[PDB]
Each structure stands twice: as C-alpha cells, then as structure tokens.
Design a protein around this nucleic acid. Sequence first.
DNA 1: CAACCGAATTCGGTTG
DNA 2: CAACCGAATTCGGTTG
Lengths: 76, 74
Amino acid sequence: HMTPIIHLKGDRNSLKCLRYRLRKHSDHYRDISSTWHWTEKTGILTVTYHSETQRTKFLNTVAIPDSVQILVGYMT
Amino acid sequence: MTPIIHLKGDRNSLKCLRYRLRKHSDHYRDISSTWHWTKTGILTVTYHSETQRTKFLNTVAIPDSVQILVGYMT
DNA sequence: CAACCGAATTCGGTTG
DNA sequence: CAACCGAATTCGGTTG
C-alpha cells in the first residue's frame, strides 16, 4: 500500500486548467485530485500512479508549467 | 513520510467537521480543505508525530458517517 | 498556459 | 452532527 505520487503546487486556477490537460491522456496516471489546499494562497494537485514506470513516463513526457512546483513522493 | 489520516464522507459533513477539529487543534499539524478524486469527500490531517495522531484519534469526535483512514504521505 | 465565463460547489460560521 | 445561510471559490470547457 505504498502508492507512487507527485504533488503539483501553484495557482489554483492554473492547477485546475492543468488537470484538464493531464486528463486528456489519463493513461499516464491513475487519478488526479480536485484542486485542494491546506487550511497557503497556493493550491495543490495530487497525482497517484500504478507504478514507478507509469510515474516515470509521466515525468518524462508531461509538460508542467514553470509556474507549477513538482514534488515527488508516496502515500498510503 | 508524515503520519496522516484521511477522513472520507459527505463533503459538507467534512467541512463542518474540520470547523470542529479546529477546537482541539493542539493534537494535529494541519488539516486540508475538502477535496476529492476526479459524491464523497476527503479531509487530510497530518501530524507532528505518531503518538500525536493516536492522542487525536482517542480524543477527537469523528462522525460515524465519516470513515477514518490511517496512513502516510509525500 | 491561464484569464475568463456562468454555474455548481465549498467556505466559515450559525442554528437547532 | 449537519442542514442552512450569505458569500467566496472552484469547476469543466473555451479561447487567444
């Protein structure tokens, strides 16, 4: 139960519009979260993956705006 | 990873729960907004420590309509 | 890549 | 514990 993920951080509307784009080819990830945040003016997009291979591909072929920050990690 | 808990349930139900959780914020690090994966909602609660999370679970009141899930993240 | 559109959703806070 | 309330935010899709 160690899921590979990444956290995309940046403007809330920006992350939302990005999600829209990431979801055009939903085969490169398991699922994407709604645009959330901690209760900070920035938002957060959570993306999970079925495997290191799937996540690895995503990071090699998916364009993330320089405005968005990328954080690689895991959850349970 | 950081010790956390995911609280699943009605989204408005969760929002109101977070409001309440803030009354005893001495036993948790931070609480997230009400989110979901793209009818039910999710609240993510992080903790300063493993023991802090335990004291939270045994002190805070979680609605039977809200599933509690222990885990780690980031 | 994100500012923008109208609408549905979520927010803190209240009330019962 | 959450239906409710007024008000702010977030949403999917569009557009430049």
